[PDB]
Amino acid sequence: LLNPKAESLRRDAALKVNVTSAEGLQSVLETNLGPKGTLKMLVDGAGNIKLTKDGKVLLTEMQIQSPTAVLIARAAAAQDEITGDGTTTVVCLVGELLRQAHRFIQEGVHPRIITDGFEIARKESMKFLDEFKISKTNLSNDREFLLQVARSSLLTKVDADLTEVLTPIVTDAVLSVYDAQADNLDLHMVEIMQMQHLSPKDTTFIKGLVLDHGGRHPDMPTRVKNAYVLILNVSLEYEKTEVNSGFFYSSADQRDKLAASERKFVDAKLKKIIDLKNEVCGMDPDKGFVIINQKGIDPMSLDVFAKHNILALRRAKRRNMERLQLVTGGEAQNSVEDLSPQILGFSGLVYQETIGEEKFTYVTENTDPKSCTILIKGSTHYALAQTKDAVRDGLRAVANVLKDKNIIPGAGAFYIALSRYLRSANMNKLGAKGKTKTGIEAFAEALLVIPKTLVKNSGFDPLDVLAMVEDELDDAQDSDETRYVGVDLNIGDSCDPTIEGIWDSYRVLRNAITGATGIASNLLLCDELLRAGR
Amino acid sequence: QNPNAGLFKQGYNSYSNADGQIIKSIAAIRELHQMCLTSMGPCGRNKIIVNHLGKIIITNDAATMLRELDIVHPAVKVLVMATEQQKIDMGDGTNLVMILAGELLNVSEKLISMGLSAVEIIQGYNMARKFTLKELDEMVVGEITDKNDKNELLKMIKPVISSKKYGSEDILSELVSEAVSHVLPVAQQAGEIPYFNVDSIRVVKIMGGSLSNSTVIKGMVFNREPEGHVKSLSEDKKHKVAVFTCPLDIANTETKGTVLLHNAQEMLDFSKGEEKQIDAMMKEIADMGVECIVAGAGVGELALHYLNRYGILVLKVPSKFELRRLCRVCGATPLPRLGAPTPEELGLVETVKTMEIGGDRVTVFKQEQGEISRTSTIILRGATQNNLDDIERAIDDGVAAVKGLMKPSGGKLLPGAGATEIELISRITKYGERTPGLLQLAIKQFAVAFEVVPRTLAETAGLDVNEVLPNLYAAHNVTEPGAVKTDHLYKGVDIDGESDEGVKDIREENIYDMLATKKFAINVATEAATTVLSIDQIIMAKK
Amino acid sequence: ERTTGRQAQISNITAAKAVADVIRTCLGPKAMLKMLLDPMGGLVLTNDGHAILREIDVAHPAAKSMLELSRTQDEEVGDGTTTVIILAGEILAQCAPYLIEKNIHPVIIIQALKKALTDALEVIKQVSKPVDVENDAAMKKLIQASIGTKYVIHWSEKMCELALDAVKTVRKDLGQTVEGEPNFEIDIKRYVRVEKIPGGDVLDSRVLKGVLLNKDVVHPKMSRHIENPRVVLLDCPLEYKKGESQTNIEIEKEEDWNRILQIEEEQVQLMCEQILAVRPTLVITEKGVSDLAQHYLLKGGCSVLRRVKKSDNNRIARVTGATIVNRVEDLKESDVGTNCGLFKVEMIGDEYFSFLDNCKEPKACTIMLRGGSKDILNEIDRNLQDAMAVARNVMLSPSLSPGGGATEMAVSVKLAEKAKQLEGIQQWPYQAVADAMECIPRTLIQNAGGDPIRLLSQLRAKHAQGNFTTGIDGDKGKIVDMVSYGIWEPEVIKQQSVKTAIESACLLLRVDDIVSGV
């Protein structure tokens, strides 16, 4: 039953290889789970050092021939397009669920009943999911509670020293861009800037928009408070004919004749701009005037802007100009002849950070900016990649907190309670099936891998911390009140996840149970590995 | 680089069930199974096995071949010991037990492919065996009256002598039935004490002549020469015969009596002493009336000289096993001493002569009426030496079937040559649908295992396998307009090689299988297959 | 290279068993998922039986023959592709020791398969039960077999209405012994052709009788809606006629050049006057229409419609009665726009449409499928064709057969009873057919996880004395009757399953030799 150049695994041998290949990828992301996990370096062919704990980014930067990790890679891709986080946790749930089920395969349990026991446990998990969840109020005074949610996302992807730095940054980034109403939130409206100069501990949040190319003159003012921003589409720089040509004067009389042809369009626009400063903000103190000027600036206007102390800008990005219309409010002016003071916008303190290689400009302190900029600083390249991964994962984690009114406590509070509930639910109810309870127990025993993994990376005994939580849950079942118990990684004993402030998104955990169920089931449903097409 | 695992005990050749050990044990038996498939039946073939003594021996019977073959497989030894049950306890079925037990393992592979446990396979055959044994009592049509008549013995002996050296069954039947009728004593209304014995018939063979020249004589015939001037005795009845265990020589002393040579004067007394003493000892034997001296040991030179003057026939029997059966003939008793032929230890024989058998002069020891003897001798003649070996073995298997004619259902008979094996298939399949449960798989395969007996008879006969099989099915399965099934239940596998077409009733040739052979072979075939199917693991060493 | 003797018969059975080995667990609704490793690094996890076989590359030619026979079965019916290969594969496996070890001639086995095929079709007719083809509620539980386990399960009630409306229109009884009888004479291919309509809701999907066209009015100012439009079909478009070869017009006279420009306007106008001879209210052109012909037909009070496929004009002629004519000057007066309900161009999904639908059946229909996206339309499209294929399977054969391994085992019980009365050499390979008929219900047991030995012994016992109504439930796994849960399939699927399996098993037995070279 074979042809030349064929390799096929039949009977239960393919199930043994698929689980064994899954145990390898499991241990890779096992030590990467939680804030106490490990931070691994991945360099493929580019010499580019990158350190991140995100489960999806690992699989995209590594080529894996194992077919088991291919479907897992498709699972991590579906979680990012929906949940946006928790890719490492889902992989740890799929890996251990195959190990607990593989032990029952040798017992003779058919894999269809194993998959049927998962769907029954998944429907019962959704019932406990609605009972265990906590409804959070839509009020905007929850920023204090948002600080606890922000730390839960940050502590995982960093060394925990940067969490306190990014805690006010990430929290204020979401509330500033999100107006308070039903509405929705847009993460694209929050810009991200990257700089390799300053250390990562010095990073700060930018309320407004920042731009790259500024005007360079020695007399330009460093700080300008409450300045008016004006978008300028005309060219302030000398221009030449479409064909290469130049104006060479042999006398002072020919100098004024040849140079006037180039500055004729410049002076016509330049003299009308400085007249706007005479009509508006001429006398009035505590006001300013700023020019965007997407096009360049000639050295002649630099001396004119220096006499009036006008902040000069040239070579502006077109994408940032559309955001300046929202932040500042000024309309794009194509012709200065039609320029009016109604087109002028309003901005706050504008100060330019002076660095030899690059210069920055801050449009910040605006009345209605309706935009945000997260400035990421770091000394090395991998420090910028890790911080950028934590911000993008942090913004998307908090994004699901405002959209989804339900919140779940973390630190193993959801996993330990669900594993203990499903084990005691089928015993009291006895409404599933007689034989199926074997496969249902495999799912309940696979839910305790996460709390055992969090303490494994910290070096604590997973059997000791598990017995301490069960003793607290038994004390919680005796009392008629509601008390949630969770594992504390720092101290090593149990903790109240509501007081400690460790919280997990409801949508992330809702798709984690259903997602890990279908992916791990399809791997057990494969009897034979087919090699064909060649 | 490649490690080793799975063997935790010691260095050996290890077999486990994960490697298909149950198939390997059947495949090892299948190597020797095909040899017995071509053995049973009148069209069967003979195999050559060279003995360890440098002698080529060819025989049809498998029970003899299994002893001469070197078998290192212990799973085959189970069937070899089961074959000994057919050879010892019975006189027929040695070739049939290897075919049945070998096929029960072949049909069991279909149940193994379905994943059925070996216990339910054994339990299925055990329930199917009781269904077959119950029918074997109803498969008997006629019964031998045990009249022990010469014409009645030809009916039972003919099929037993068959399936070896085909074509001679008519001549060999008259030779065996004549010798058996002589051993069987004359009695009536007594069934308690057995009579016939297997060792009571001693077969001899001498090169020369043909098979038609063979005869049957009452007595024990000796091939040795008379060794002395007296070739044969007279025709007077009741000749006195003395059996001496001690060799013929000068009389010695029970206490010490060691002969030593020292001086030449003693040497002259030793030569002259043996002349006077032997002449004195042999004279006292002739004075008491002993005309024949049977010496189990050697005979001296001076003993033959003095017995020629007294007219005493000298007879030497170097085999001590033949002297024990000789006492039941003449009535003489062996004497460990010499010189005192007590008349209480002397027997009587009517006729002792010397006849030419196959061209050589041999002394015949026989009788007529008085002094009834329980031992008979079958004299054989032929040119081929190898053919005479199988004929003697055919007679031994023929007389052993006479032992099966005793009280334990020795007269009952059933049609053979493929007649019963096909009819039992329809009865077993009838009980398959009748018995509910998982046993239906093993019961149906138990009837298919009986299809090998008619198939081998067709293969050994050169017949097409696609012909005889559907012909036997339509012959034993018919629709009779009535409650009682009628017409021909006797259709077997015909020897063919002649005549016209198809099959025919086996009653035309008066051939049948004895119930004692068939019923006992089924119990041995099931227990032989039960042992193999019950063993899922073995541990051996390099031999 | 070349394989002769009995070795080719071994490879033919091995190749058929190897291909069936893959789909062993691919049979039934409980079929599990397969993983195909591509040489480029791709994987296919789909559990569909016939979707995997097209991606499997095989070497031995007998394995390629099973893929070609499954391709024919895939086009005729949507399901049951793995049923034929597994059934035909087990026939060669049970007859493997008979062909070689038993020394049976292959034609004797092939002739026995022909007698076993005829006896099997008679048993299928006996185990079948009558079904009402005019019952609307009964056809919904049948067509649902091709519906459930798909996205259309929520609309299944509306999915059956769209299927029955198309089948009842194209079916012609014509029952009689004179010219021969096609049973209900359903044609899905030509008449039932569907055009997908974007936008709207799935609940609003209706079956229109007529021809639908996406092209709108081609003129800025023209009547948008015609009460009773009269269709006129034509082939050659409306424009200045030119020769099919190279044409060179050399005129040396001054004022004749202006006359040629007038003929170009008169030639297009002459083509419009020949159309207006019957005074039509609608003009439909297969190819494009020049702007000159648009103004000439505008003064005549008739709509102009260009860009129409040729396959539509064949259906437009039957839903209208306009005769298709090649040259416009040859246009016959027999063209009629009768039996046209509405011309309404009303826009659906930000695109102007054209509706020829009417209130009568012109021996055809056009199914209008609307939904919330194009992906839903393409899903309903293929599902509706498969829903009508199962509906056609029920109409052509007015009987239903029990599923879940009930029909497969019931035939094997009857084959074992007919084997005793055969009395021939073919009896041995004929009993192997019943053993292969028992592998299909054993296949569903091995996929369910139950004990095959314990269940088949109980399953076979319930057919003899239980009126062969006892099948096996897929979801539960306990042996139950098929009358309660109502699991039934049309007979034509069971007929073509055993018919192709014997043809596939005999074809591999007919080839005893394999040679190579051109």
Per-residue 3-state assignment (H helix, E strand, C coil) for A462-482: HHHHHHHHHHHHHHHHHCCCC
User: B1-143+412-543 and B144-218+371-411 share one CATH topology?
Assistant: no
Contacts of C57 (CB under 8 A, 6+ apart): A532, A533, A534
Q: Tell the burial category of C260 from Cβ atoms under 10 Å away from its Cβ (0-12, 13-18, 19+).
A: exposed
Contacts of A299 (CB under 8 A, 6+ apart): none
Structure token pair of residue A458: 């910290």
| Of residues A87, A133, A56, the one with CA closest to residue A505 | A133
- Give partners of A (≥3 CB pairs < 8 A): C
Catalytic residue status for C82: yes
Helix/strand number for chain A, H first, E second: 17, 17
Domain boundaries, chain B: 1-143+412-543, 144-218+371-411, 219-370
C211 vs C198: CA distance, rounded Å: 17
Q: Do chains C and A touch (3 or more CB pairs under 8 A)?
A: yes
C41 vs A256: CA distance, rounded Å: 72
B219-370: what fold? GroEL (3.50.7)
Cβ of residue A526 closer than 8 Å to a chain C Cβ: yes
Q: Which chain B residues have a beta carbon less than 8 Å from that of C102?
A: 465
| Of residues B204, B210, B225, the one with CA closest to residue B360 | B225
C315 vs C336: CA distance, rounded Å: 14
Strands (E), C242-364: 282-284, 303-305, 354-355
Catalytic residue status for C386: yes
Q: Pairing between strand A205-206 and C35-37?
A: unpaired
A398 vs A404: CA distance, rounded Å: 10
Q: Report resolution in angstroms.
A: 4.7
**Quick check: C427 and B470 CB within 8 A?**
yes
Q: Specify the 3-state DSSP secondary structure of C399.
A: strand
Q: Tell the burial category of A443 from Cβ atoms under 10 Å away from its Cβ (0-12, 13-18, 19+).
A: buried
Per-residue 3-state assignment (H helix, E strand, C coil) for C159-227: HHHHHHHHHHHHCCCCCCCCCCCCCCCCCCCCCCCCEEECCCCCCCCEEECCCEECCCCCCCCCCCCCC
**Quick check: C57 and A529 CB within 8 A?**
no
C139 vs C155: CA distance, rounded Å: 15
Whether residue A328 contacts residue A347, with contact meaning beta carbons closer than 8 Å, is answered with yes
Contacts of B130 (CB under 8 A, 6+ apart): none
Whether residue A220 contacts residue A290, with contact meaning beta carbons closer than 8 Å, is answered with no
**Cα C237 → chain centroid:** 35
Catalytic residue status for C81: yes
Place of tokens 């009980």: B431
Half-sphere exposure of A384 (CA within 13 A, CB side): 17
C243 vs C263: CA distance, rounded Å: 15
Half-sphere exposure of C130 (CA within 13 A, CB side): 2
How many beta-carbon contacts under 8 Å exist across B and C? 31
Give the active site residue among C25, C74, C79, C81. C81
C-chain residue closest to B113, CA distance: C453
Q: Tell the burial category of C507 from Cβ atoms under 10 Å away from its Cβ (0-12, 13-18, 19+).
A: middle
Helix (H) or strand (E) holding C418: helix C406-419
**Quick check: C21 and A1 CB within 8 A?**
yes
Whether residue B195 contacts residue B185, with contact meaning beta carbons closer than 8 Å, is answered with yes
Chain C residues within 8 angstroms (CB to CB) of chain A: 14, 17-18, 21-22, 25, 30, 32-41, 43, 45, 47, 52, 55-60, 63, 447-449
**Quick check: A533 and C57 CB within 8 A?**
yes
Whether residue A404 contacts residue A512, with contact meaning beta carbons closer than 8 Å, is answered with no
**Quick check: B466 and C423 CB within 8 A?**
no
C292 vs C307: CA distance, rounded Å: 16
Q: Pairing between strand B215-217 and B239-244?
A: unpaired
**Domains and their CATH numbers in chain A:** 1-136+406-534 (1.10.560.10), 137-207+370-405 (3.30.260.10), 208-369 (no CATH)
Place of tokens 């059966």: B325
How many Cβ atoms are within 10 Å of B36's Cβ, its own excluded? 25
- The minimum CA-CA distance between B80 and chain C, rounded to whole Å, is 27
Considering the domain C210-357, what is its CATH architecture? 3-Layer(bba) Sandwich (3.50)
Helix (H) or strand (E) holding B207: strand B201-207
A420 vs C299: CA distance, rounded Å: 84
A201 vs A204: CA distance, rounded Å: 9
| Of residues A131, A128, A133, A134, the one with CA closest to residue A419 | A128
A304 vs A301: CA distance, rounded Å: 5
C-chain residue closest to B476, CA distance: C423
Cβ density class C284-300: b for 16+ within 10 Å, e for less = bbbeebeebbbebbbee
Which of C14, C35, C447 minimises the CB distance to A530? C35
Q: DSSP alpha helices (H): ranges in B319-371?
A: 320-326
C232 vs C321: CA distance, rounded Å: 9
C387 vs B72: CA distance, rounded Å: 67
Q: Which chain C residues have a beta carbon less than 8 Å from that of B114?
A: 452-453
A12 vs A105: CA distance, rounded Å: 8
Torsion B331-B333-B338-B340 (CA) sign: negative
Which of A4, A67, A527 minimises the CB distance to C25? A527
Whether residue B447 contacts residue B28, with contact meaning beta carbons closer than 8 Å, is answered with no
Contacts of B49 (CB under 8 A, 6+ apart): B57, B58, B59, B65, B68, B69
Q: Return the axis-axis angle of helices A413-429 and A449-457, rounded to nearest 10°.
A: 150
Q: Which residue, among C32, C40, C60, C445, would best test binding to A if mutated, counting the most A CBs under 10 Å from its CB?
A: C32
Q: Pairing between strand C470-472 and B360-366?
A: unpaired
Cβ of residue C478 closer than 8 Å to a chain B Cβ: no
User: B144-218+371-411, which class in CATH?
Assistant: alpha beta
The technique by which this structure was obtained is: cryo-EM
Query: Dihedral, CA atoms, B226, B231, B235, B236, nearest 10 degrees?
Result: -70
Give the active site residue among C3, C14, C48, C165. C48
Place of tokens 């720092």: A490
Chain B residues within 8 angstroms (CB to CB) of chain C: 114-116, 436-438, 440-441, 465-466, 469-470, 473-474, 477
- The minimum CA-CA distance between B498 and chain C, rounded to whole Å, is 24
- Give partners of B (≥3 CB pairs < 8 A): C
The 8-class DSSP code of residue C323 comes to: P
Per-residue 3-state assignment (H helix, E strand, C coil) for C349-381: CCCCCEECCCCCCCCCCEEEEECCCHHHHHHHH
Cβ of residue A429 closer than 8 Å to a chain C Cβ: no
Cα distances (Å, whole numbers) of residue C234 to A503, B13, C198, C285: 72, 89, 29, 6
**Quick check: B466 and C452 CB within 8 A?**
no
- The minimum CA-CA distance between C494 and chain B, rounded to whole Å, is 26
Which superfamily, per CATH, for B1-143+412-543?
GroEL-like equatorial domain (1.10.560.10)
Structure token pair of residue B47: 């195999």
Per-residue 3-state assignment (H helix, E strand, C coil) for B392-431: HHHHHHHHHHHHCCCCCCCCEEECCCCHHHHHHHHHHHHH
Identity of the amino acid at C242: K
**Quick check: C47 and A525 CB within 8 A?**
yes
Half-sphere exposure of C85 (CA within 13 A, CB side): 33
